[PDB]
């Protein structure tokens, strides 16, 4: 038998405003959620998630095999050695059901000094032909900035929750250098669904994606209305109920590092469900050289002996390790 995780709905709208006491009351709710199962739903977030879902579906359902090869990351197309992050992640019929499209900061252009310097984890986004996908790039770039704005407000809540001034995290989250990414993931309905695309957990549960901690400061996730996620607790995995009107929020392992595990990065996994659905995460990443000094809210002096960790190294190592452990997506 499988229990259900407590995932509170938090009205985050005060984080956009100037009522400081109301922001502290949101912060308390973020603190409680982060110390419990590690997840909450952000509601009253101001993003049109119906349009996000509609535009994403229109793209997933109209892109052709030829277009997928043209946009494919290096793991699927040897001609594209510069694409380790951004581009198309192909399905393999009979073997791999999931497919996705990842894009990064639109400000990463050939003019950007991190592209000029060839710094790892920075790439120029690739896009389908505008005439074949009218409005897609424009929608996707505006969405990046819409969810950036929500994430900046959520970061104010996390800072206040930890006893800091509201810009403690957000000051490192900037349009000119953020390594944040959007991934538009399609999980298809398939009949028959090939068993090769289904993994079996130690506890016997059929999975599409195994346990992991997120590589992020925080993760800001929209999913369509098909229950699939489970969070690990000491008493076992618990189902996270779906909510296609909100954003599911959690801390990633960079947050766990810098708080000395006070806000743990929750471990979750994806149950196998034979249903057409969408999983659209925004990974809130900082800049390549961002360093946040670790602290320990449990200690009166807040002292932590954990070493400061540069975000770029954290991200490069984390994304490689996640592929090694959980497979190329
Ligand atoms: C659990 C969800 C967040 C979603 N999973 C995911 O988003 C998956 C698996 S944890 N995420 C990743 O592998 C990291 C993607 C990083 C991205 N290419 C980038 O360059 O920044 C799903 O539905 O599988
Ligand atoms: Fe996760």
Swiss-Prot record:
Cofactor(s) the record lists: Fe(2+)
GO molecular function terms listed in the Swiss-Prot or TrEMBL record: iron ion binding; isopenicillin-N synthase activity; L-ascorbic acid binding
Enzyme Commission number: 1.21.3.1
S-adenosyl-L-methionine found in the keyword field: no
Effect on the protein of changing residue 96 to E: Strongly reduced the catalytic activity
Subcellular location(s) of the protein: Cytoplasm, Cytosol
Cofactor: record remark: Binds 1 Fe(2+) ion per subunit.
Annotated site, Transition state stabilizer, chain positions: 209
GO cellular-component term (any): cytosol
Broad class of enzyme this protein falls into: oxidoreductase
One Pfam family linked to the record: DIOX_N
Pathway involvement of the protein, from the record: Antibiotic biosynthesis; penicillin G biosynthesis; penicillin G from L-alpha-aminoadipate and L-cysteine and L-valine: step 2/3
Catalyses which reaction(s): N-[(5S)-5-amino-5-carboxypentanoyl]-L-cysteinyl-D-valine + O2 = isopenicillin N + 2 H2O
Database matches in InterPro entries: DIOX_N, IPNS-like_FE2OG_OXY, IPNS-like_sf, Isopenicillin-N_synth_CS, Oxoglu/Fe-dep_dioxygenase_dom
Alphabetical UniProt keywords: Antibiotic biosynthesis, Cytoplasm, Iron, Metal-binding, Oxidoreductase, Vitamin C
Binding site for 2-oxoglutarate: 277
Residues the entry annotates as binding N-[(5S)-5-amino-5-carboxypentanoyl]-L-cysteinyl-D-valine: 85, 89, 181, 187, 212, 214, 279
Domain annotation Fe2OG dioxygenase: ranges: 174-286
Binding site for Fe(2+): 212, 214, 268
Domain of life according to the entry: Eukaryota
GO annotation terms (biological process): penicillin biosynthetic process
Role noted for this protein: Isopenicillin N synthase; part of the gene cluster that mediates the biosynthesis of penicillin, the world's most important antibiotic. IpnA catalyzes the cyclization of the tripeptide N-[(5S)-5-amino-5-carboxypentanoyl]-L-cysteinyl-D-valine (LLD-ACV or ACV) to form isopenicillin N (IPN) that contains the beta-lactam nucleus. The penicillin biosynthesis occurs via 3 enzymatic steps, the first corresponding to the production of the tripeptide N-[(5S)-5-amino-5-carboxypentanoyl]-L-cysteinyl-D-valine (LLD-ACV or ACV) by the NRPS acvA.
Family that this chain belongs to: Belongs to the iron/ascorbate-dependent oxidoreductase family.
Subunit structure: Monomer.
Protein name stated in the entry: Isopenicillin N synthase
Species this chain originates from: Emericella nidulans (strain FGSC A4 / ATCC 38163 / CBS 112.46 / NRRL 194 / M139)
């Amino acid at each position: 038998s499988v229990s259900k995780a407590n995932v509170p709905k938090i009205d985050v709208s005060p984080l956009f405003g100037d009522d400081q006491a109301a922001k502290m009351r949101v912060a308390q709710q973020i603190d409680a959620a982060s110390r419990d199962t590690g997840f909450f739903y952000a509601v009253n977030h101001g993003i049109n998630v119906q349009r996000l879902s509609q535009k994403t579906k229109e793209f997933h359902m109209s892109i052709t095999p030829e277009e997928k090869w043209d946009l494919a990351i290096r793991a699927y197309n040897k001609e594209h050695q510069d694409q380790v992050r951004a581009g198309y992640y192909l399905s393999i019929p009979g073997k791999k059901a999931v497919e996705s499209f990842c894009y990064l900061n639109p400000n990463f252009t050939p003019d950007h000094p991190r592209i000029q310097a060839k710094t790892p984890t920075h790439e120029v986004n690739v896009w389908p032909d505008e005439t074949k996908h009218p409005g897609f790039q424009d929608f996707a770039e505006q969405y990046y900035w819409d969810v950036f704005g929500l994430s900046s407000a959520l970061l104010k809540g996390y800072a206040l929750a930890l006893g800091k001034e509201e810009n403690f995290f957000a000051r490192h989250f900037k349009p000119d250098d953020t390594l944040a990414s959007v991934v538009l993931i399609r999980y298809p309905y398939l009949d028959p669904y090939p068993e090769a695309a289904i993994k079996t957990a130690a506890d016997g549960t059929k999975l599409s994606f195994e346990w992991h901690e997120d590589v992020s400061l925080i993760t800001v996730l929209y999913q369509s209305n098909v229950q699939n996620l489970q969070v690990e607790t000491a008493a076992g995995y618990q189902d996270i109920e779906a909510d296609d009107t909100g954003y599911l929020i959690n801390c990633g392992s960079y947050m766990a590092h810098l708080t000395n595990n006070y806000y743990k990065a929750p471990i979750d996994r994806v149950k196998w469900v034979n249903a057409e659905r969408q999983s659209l995460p925004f990974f809130v990443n900082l800049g390549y050289d961002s360093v946040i000094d670790p602290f320990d809210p449990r200690e009166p002096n807040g002292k932590s002996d954990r070493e400061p960790l540069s975000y770029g190294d954290y991200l490069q190592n984390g994304l490689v390790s996640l592929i090694n452990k959980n497979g190329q997506t």
